[PDB]
Amino acid sequence: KIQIQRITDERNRQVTFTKRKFGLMKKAYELSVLCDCEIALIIFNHSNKLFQYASTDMDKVLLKYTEYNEPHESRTNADIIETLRKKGF
């Protein structure tokens, strides 16, 4: 196992990335179908190249999002760090 930290190697991160992201798209695709929901993923690498996923119409979702006015779940890496760290392994 590795602990979650910046892959300092260059050929490593560009491989982990290229596959770990397909994972994210997979898990999303699956959740998308199972629970019947719209999803939209957006990934910029360190060199600002775009990679995107959407169960359906990407921009229709990103729009719906801007219009949303109620409060709603909003997580950051910090939120998730402190939800796994408050979870003694």
Residues near DNA (CB under 7 A) are 1-2, 12, 15-16, 19-20, 22-24, 26-27
Task: Report how far residue 47's alpha carbon sits from residue 26's, in angstroms, rounded to the nearest whole number.
Answer: 23
CB of 60 to DNA, least distance (A): 25
Which residues 24-53 are close enough to bind a copy of itself by CB under 8 A?
24-46, 48-53
Going by the DSSP 8-state scheme, the letter that residue 87 receives in this structure is S
Question: What's the length of the chain?
Answer: 89
Q: Which of 7, 11, 88, 89 binds a copy of itself (CB under 8 A)?
A: 7
**First-last CA distance in the chain:** 14
Least Å distance between CB 18 and DNA? 9
**Contact yes or no for 25/39 (Cβ under 8 A):** no
Dihedral Cα 66, 70, 71, 75, nearest 10 deg: -30
Q: Which residues bind a copy of itself (CB under 8 A)?
A: 2, 4-7, 13-14, 16-17, 20-46, 48-56, 58, 61-62, 64-66, 68, 70, 72-77, 80-81, 83-84
